[PDB]
Design a protein around this nucleic acid. Structure first.
Lengths: 104, 97, 78, 93, 93, 106, 84, 98
DNA sequence: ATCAATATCCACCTGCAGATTCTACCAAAAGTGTATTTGGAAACTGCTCCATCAAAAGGCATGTTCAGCTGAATTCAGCTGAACATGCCTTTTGATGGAGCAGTTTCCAAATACACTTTTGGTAGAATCTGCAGGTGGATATTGAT
DNA sequence: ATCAATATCCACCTGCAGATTCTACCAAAAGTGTATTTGGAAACTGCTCCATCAAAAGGCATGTTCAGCTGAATTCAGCTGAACATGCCTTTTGATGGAGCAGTTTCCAAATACACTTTTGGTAGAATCTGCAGGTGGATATTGAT
């Protein structure tokens, strides 16, 4: 019967709503579906990151996604890189050395 | 005997460290500095180890990026060596000044 | 204490940042910068600590501070 | 003494897109910070939108416009699709 | 339909500091933008502070911390003074 | 009789209006203390005063009686703290005159 | 009405030069004017894209100065003097 | 005589001049046209408060002027005096724009 | 580009422990079901304000010429910063405590939200008041050629 | 050094667009006396934080040697700035129609607000495991030198 099930999402529509009722100022309300919509958004973007990161880990012969993988997935992707100007702790940087700095 | 030409070990270190994710500042000196800086804002403070680690991560991320922009400024100037005027230019364009 | 932030460690940071050759004056410069950074962040953090009437700077204090400095960090509570 | 986290749901989504792949605690941490960040961004923009237009309810329309505003195109297209799909399916049953 | 402003009060304060000096409409416009801006920021930081400390109410204590973040150095010291002072004056009925 | 809360606080800025704007921001789902409006009105007033002080001076320096956006810009860019606090764009403010040494004739 | 095309070239070389002059620039390479146009288009696109998104959200056909002010705030290019 | 200012003297006059003034530097009508053209390629049948066009021009000119200041710094840093696309790119990159 | 040697890096495979993933019972949200409350959508429409048109005039953009000096290329040597092996201290680690103190309760006064009835203060205009934009003309530079 | 050529001032002048000031009610402020909470205030648990300690092993600080980078000096092709002729198109003044905001109403569909009944996610305990970090030994890379 859960709204997450009804919406066909893994993410918690109910919790998302309970969190949204703390953003509507005073005298503020939240649509029945805003919770569903946001839940969907969060789930989708989580899926996108998790996919790219799992790829980075398969291409690295490991089973567990680490933060390095998360970093490689984010920075390796134009859109994710654009959206996530956070700092992934323990992700390091992407290897890159400038042309003019190499020998001969 | 045997000796590497200047620049070679450098490039080797660049490869190595760009490969790893480890903190490059030693933990205790850093903690010590954090504590001393903080002492001047509120006295007898304690720190979650997570807070010191957050600080150190934030720092090293910051200094690494800043070094990237700095290196770019040195390359603008047809150099290969970064100088304080490079860090200065970088920080200005960033609006940190 | 700031001098405790050693030349070879700053070398390491530069290296990860793709730097091949380092001027002698870079280390003092880097220290100054790192000090301003830590000052700006800790000040804010501790302000959150004191507002929460605590004697203990929490990681969340640092995370909130970092977020205010537009230096958002992932992995410690947000 | 409870402390809610998106860990469970992240893990679930992981198992859908990569049933073979696991996740470290630090990584799971990043994922949390990610979800919280984006949630706060969306929520913020949505409340702002409703304000600008002198509304009091945050509807899915605020959520959607906010998504257009926050997410770079393509991520935004797909996010809009997912959102509308979730909502239709939810409104049918 | 009346739409509010800060012009009346900017103007008062103006006459207080430089009683000889006028302000052009565009300047007043900037001033209004300035005030609504800093108001926004203070309110925002305050609501966040309240959130972080499981508190449902925003008090002078919130505003004061908000002002300590936000405002640099001397501005902050003087602002705190003026606020604290206005508040103690206001309480002593 | 009725004393306004602004008067009660010794302020030119509107404590009531500001309290209303804080109720409507807001919390969310929460409440605003009696003093928060006062403390806010006081900060906003103080800063309007700091700005108007510096601007007014600039207006004097240019032998004019009436503050324009240019003046506001001179005052804000001229002061380290206002300049830090205010990274807005001031429509009609122009820039502060500044040429680099290297550009100047040898 | 009438087809709109190449209006970026409306941003004349002398106007760009003036802008660099306020920007404190003494000497200007011939390749600046096209670069600048490039940059201006991107800037404008982004702001307008957001502004219109606000317009559309409000079910309006007219882009208001408020739409641009919100747009600008989003881009972190906050503007004083139109916000009211 | 005839009479010529040496190359760079007028340029400096213009820096002083425009640094002194505050009026918009791009001609108003062409700018409007650019705005309408860009908007149109996003949503047809749009209208603009004149106010909105002006807000945009203010924002844009402020933007270009600051950008040129940064660019001018990169030129100087390169021990030059002529700004080049190189510089604008260096500035925008460091500004974290591109 | 080879002939050597010194070191670096790279794959394959290995074995345990620090981290996982997996399992198992109690509070605190999430869903149901009923009864108001209310926001803001649908519908007339008053009425700013936007697009368009017209037309005249000079402020500017455009294009060309011509040569000054700037960027870019080259060469070069002083000296800075890298590589390195040498010698030692400070960071790192890891069980112990002790204890400071974040977090959790369990509780009444202070403090906030209400909900109605007056009592102003601010706002949208009319209506007076004046800065100053913008046009002068000579005093004082400021430049650049002999 | 000069003067000659222009540009830059700086101050005086004055009616006009733009302020500052005078005027009428609606919305919003203040004063009431109900109602509800909330957060602070104490008194105590447990986590997790500081502080020694007592060391191996790192990792840093040191002085040598010199390779190679930076910067200084010097040339020059030609890009870009200054000036000029020419005339387009932006600017400025004004009016027109009508699109479209935006100010009002009336009021279903959707939201809140209870009060219950279940359900699930957080916790702190168990049962595997991924892969770190360490082995070869095998090519690669780098640097001196046919």
């Amino acid at each position: 019967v859960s709204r997450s099930q009804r919406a066909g999402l893994q993410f918690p529509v109910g919790r998302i709503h309970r969190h949204l009722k703390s953003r509507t100022t005073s005298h503020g309300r939240v649509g029945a579906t805003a919770a569903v919509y946001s839940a969907a958004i969060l789930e989708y973007l989580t899926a996108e990151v998790l996919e790219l990161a799992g790829n980075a880990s398969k291409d690295l012969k490991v089973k567990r996604i680490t933060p390095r993988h998360l970093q490689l997935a984010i920075r390796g992707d134009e859109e994710l890189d654009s959206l996530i100007k956070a700092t992934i702790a323990g992700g390091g940087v992407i290897p890159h050395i400038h042309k003019s700095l190499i020998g001969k | 005997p045997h000796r590497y030409r200047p620049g070679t070990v450098a490039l080797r270190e660049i490869r190595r460290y760009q490969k790893s994710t480890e903190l490059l500042i030693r933990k205790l000196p850093f903690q010590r500095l954090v504590r001393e800086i903080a002492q001047d804002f509120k006295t007898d403070l304690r720190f979650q180890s997570s807070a010191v680690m957050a600080l150190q991560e934030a720092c090293e991320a910051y200094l690494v990026g800043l070094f990237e922009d700095t290196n770019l400024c040195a390359i603008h100037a047809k150099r290969v060596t970064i100088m304080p005027k490079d860090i200065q230019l970088a920080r200005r364009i960033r609006g940190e000044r | 204490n700031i001098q405790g932030i050693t030349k070879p460690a700053i070398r390491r940071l530069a290296r990860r940042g793709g730097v091949k050759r380092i001027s002698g004056l870079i280390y003092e410069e880097t220290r100054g910068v790192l000090k301003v950074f830590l000052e700006n962040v800790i000040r804010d953090a501790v302000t959150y600590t004191e507002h929460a009437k605590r004697k203990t700077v929490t990681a969340m204090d640092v995370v909130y501070a970092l977020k205010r400095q537009g230096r958002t960090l992932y992995g410690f509570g947000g | 003494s409870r402390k809610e986290s998106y860990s469970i749901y992240v893990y679930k989504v992981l198992k859908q897109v990569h049933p073979d792949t696991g996740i470290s605690s630090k990584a799971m941490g990043i994922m949390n910070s990610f979800v919280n960040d984006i949630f706060e961004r969306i929520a913020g923009e949505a409340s702002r939108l409703a304000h600008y237009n002198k509304r009091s309810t945050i509807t899915s329309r605020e959520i959607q416009t906010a998504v257009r505003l926050l997410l770079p195109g393509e991520l935004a297209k797909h996010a809009v699709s997912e959102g509308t799909k979730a909502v239709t399916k939810y409104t049918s049953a």
